[PDB]
Design a protein around this ligand. Structure first.
Ligand SMILES: CCC1(C)CCCCC1
Ligand SMILES: CCC1(C)CCCCC1
Ligand SMILES: CC(C)OP(C)(=O)O
Ligand SMILES: CC(C)OP(C)(=O)O
Ligand SMILES: [Zn+2]
Ligand SMILES: [Zn+2]
Ligand SMILES: [Zn+2]
Ligand SMILES: [Zn+2]
Lengths: 330, 330
C-alpha cells in the first residue's frame, strides 16, 4: 500500500499521473560530484530540472520514476532537492545499467542481490532514501555479468515486491532472453516492464512479451533525429522513426487488448554526460516540451486517433500504480 | 618548493621516505559510498589502513603517493582521515586508470585536460584537496581514449609541473608508446614515471626508457603468487616471479647508472573491490608486512646484495622528492 519516493513513502492514490522511465541526469557514478562544471554547475542542473518538472506538473504529471542506477550516476540527494522544489514525486531506482565498473562486474549473483536489497530495504548510500524499482540492461545477447544482474534483480523483486524495469536493444528482441532469465528465477511477468520497446515496430516481438504478462515500456516517444540534418551522433542515439510512429505503438497494443500492460514515458533528462558533449542541447531542440511531451503532445495525438480519455487515464495513472505497488503478483 | 597532500602543502624535506605507488583502497567511483559493507564497514577499512600505515611509519615511511584516480574510486576524505590518524603524508592523484565510465570515455583531450587541471589547481570534488600527481594507464596498445588521456595528462603536467605516473602491461612494452605520446605533447621524461616496470625482466625495454630520462617505477615488489597453490585468480594478478626477482631489478638499474631514476613501491592496498572477492585476504597472506615490505624486507635484501645505505636513501628519499617537486624539468 506504499511506494518509496526520494521524500519517503506515498500512498498509491498520491502517485497520480506517472512517467515510468525518466532521468534527472544521465551520468556516471561520482561524475557530478567530481566535475559539476561539465553541467555548467550543480546549481544550473538543479534549476533546469526544477523548471522542467514544474512544466510537467502544470501539464498534469504528479510522479516520475527516475530509472537512473548507480552506474547512471544517480544522485538521490539531487533527486530529493528537485522533487521538493518542483512538487513532483520521484521514485528512485537500484539495479545496474550498461556501464557497471569493475567493482560491480566482478560480483556474484548473491553479492549483487545483497546490493540491490540494500538500496530497496535499507537505503541508498547514507541517505535513508529507498529505491522503488530495479533497473537492468542488455544491448543484444546478455553478457555473462548481465545474466547475473537480471537474476539478482529477480531475487531482489521476489524478496520485496518492487518491480523490475529493463533497457533493451528492442530491434535485437532482448526482452525474449530477459523474460527467459527472469522466469528461470521464478519472477512473475506482472512485476516486469520490458523497456525501450517503442524502438521496434515488430508486433510479433511486442505481443509475444505482452501475451505472457509483461508490461511493455513505450518510453522514448519524443526520441527522433528526423529533421536533424547531418548529425550522426544524434541519429545513432535517437533513430529516424518519428514520435508519431512510436506513439502509434500505444494504439496498436490497445487495439490488441493490452491496454492494462502499457507504460508510457519520454526517457528525458535535464543533464547528459554519458554521450557526446552538447547532446542535451540537441535533444532540447528536438523536444522543447521535455517530460511534458507525453501529456501535451502524445495524449492529444492518441485522442485524435480515437483512443478514449478513460483508456489514456488507465495507461498514465492506473497501470503505473499497479506496477509500482509492491507485490509478488500484480 | 611545496608538494600538495590530502592535509595541505608540505615542504620537500617533510616528504622523507616516500612510497611512490600505493593505494588506501582499490575500488570504483561511488562504490565505497554505495556499498561500504563490501569492506565490512567504512570504519573497518579506516582502522585497517591506519594500522597498516602506522606499521609503515614505524619502519621509516613518512609519505605515500596514493595513485588511485576517479575510476579507482579515490575518496580523498578517506585518505585525509587515514593520513591524520597514522601521521603519514598522503599525496592524492588525478588522471584516469583502466576503468573510466562513459561520462569520461566520451570526452575530448581538451575536456580531460580541464578535468585533470581542476583536481590539481582547484580541488577534488568539494574538498579543496589538490592532487600532487597524474595517473594514467594502458594495457597493451593504447585505446583511442587512452591516447587522449595520456595527452591530457601531458598538458596538465606542462601547465602545473605536477608529475605523471603510469600503469603498463610491462611485458607488452607499453612505456615505449606512452613515451611517444608524452613526447609528442612536449612533456619532459623527467616528469614521468613508467610504472609496473618490475613486471618485466626485459632490460632492453627498461634501459630504453631510462636512457631517454624516464623514471622507472619498480612498484610491485611483494606481488607474487609463488607458493599460493591452485589460485588462478591470484596467479593472473600477482604473477609467478618472486619478490627477489623483482627486487633485483633495482640492483640491475643501479648497476647500469640509473640510481637517480628508480622509484620503488609495494602497490599495496587496504581494500580491493575491483577484483575477485577475498583477493585482499589472499594478498595479506602473501605479504603480511603490507606497505612496510619495502623498508623491512627489500632494503635489507639489497644491502645484503652489496647496495649501499647511501644509494638506497637516494632512491627512497631524494628521487621521490625530485619527482614530486613541481617543475617542467627535474
Ligand atoms: C475499446 C478500446 C477503447 C475505445 C476503450 C476506451 C479507450 C480507448 C480505447
Ligand atoms: C657504485 C654503486 C653503489 C655502490 C653506490 C653506493 C650505493 C650502492 C651502489
Ligand atoms: C542515459 C541513458 C540512461 O539513457 P537510456 C537512453 O539508456 O534510457
Ligand atoms: C587496483 C589497481 C589500481 O591496482 P593496480 C594493480 O593497477 O596498481
Ligand atoms: Zn536505456
Ligand atoms: Zn533511460
Ligand atoms: Zn596499475
Ligand atoms: Zn596501483
Amino acid at each position: 500500500d506504499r511506494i518509496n519516493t526520494v521524500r519517503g513513502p506515498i500512498t498509491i492514490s498520491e502517485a497520480g499521473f506517472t512517467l515510468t522511465h525518466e532521468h534527472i541526469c544521465g551520468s556516471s557514478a561520482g561524475f557530478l560530484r567530481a566535475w559539476p562544471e561539465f553541467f555548467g554547475s550543480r546549481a544550473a542542473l538543479v534549476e533546469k530540472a526544477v523548471r522542467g518538472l514544474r512544466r510537467a506538473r502544470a501539464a498534469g504529471v504528479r510522479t516520475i520514476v527516475d530509472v537512473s542506477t548507480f552506474d547512471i550516476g544517480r544522485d538521490v540527494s539531487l533527486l530529493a532537492e528537485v522533487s521538493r522544489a518542483a512538487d513532483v514525486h520521484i521514485v528512485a531506482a537500484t539495479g545496474l545499467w550498461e556501464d557497471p565498473p569493475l567493482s560491480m562486474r566482478l560480483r556474484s549473483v548473491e553479492e549483487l542481490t545483497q546490493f540491490f536489497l540494500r538500496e530497496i530495504q535499507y537505503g541508498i548510500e547514507d541517505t535513508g532514501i529507498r529505491a522503488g524499482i530495479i533497473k537492468v540492461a542488455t544491448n543484444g545477447k546478455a553478457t555473462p555479468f548481465q545474466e547475473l544482474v537480471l537474476r539478482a534483480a529477480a531475487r531482489a523483486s521476489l524478496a520485496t515486491g518492487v518491480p523490475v524495469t529493463t533497457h533493451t536493444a528492442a530491434s535485437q528482441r532482448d526482452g525474449e532472453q530477459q523474460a527467459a532469465i527472469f522466469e528461470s528465477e521464478g519472477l512473475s511477468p506482472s512485476r516486469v516492464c520490458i523497456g525501450h520497446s517503442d524502438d521496434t515496430d515488430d508486433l510479433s516481438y511486442l505481443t509475444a512479451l505482452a501475451a505472457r504478462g509483461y508490461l511493455i515500456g513505450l518510453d522514448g516517444i519524443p526520441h527522433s533525429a528526423i529533421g536533424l540534418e547531418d548529425n550522426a551522433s544524434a541519429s545513432a542515439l535517437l533513430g529516424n522513426r518519428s514520435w508519431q510512429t512510436r506513439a502509434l505503438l500505444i494504439k496498436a497494443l490497445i487495439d490488441q487488448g493490452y491496454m492494462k500492460q502499457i507504460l508510457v514515458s519520454n526517457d528525458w533528462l535535464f543533464g547528459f554526460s554519458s554521450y557526446v558533449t552538447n547532446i542535451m542541447d540537441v535533444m532540447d531542440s528536438v523536444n522543447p516540451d521535455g517530460m511534458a511531451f507525453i501529456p501535451l503532445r502524445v495524449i492529444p495525438f492518441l485522442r485524435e486517433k480515437g483512443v478514449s480519455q478513460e483508456t489514456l487515464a488507465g495507461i498514465t495513472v492506473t497501470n503505473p500504480a499497479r506496477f509500482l505497488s509492491p507485490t509478488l503478483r500484480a
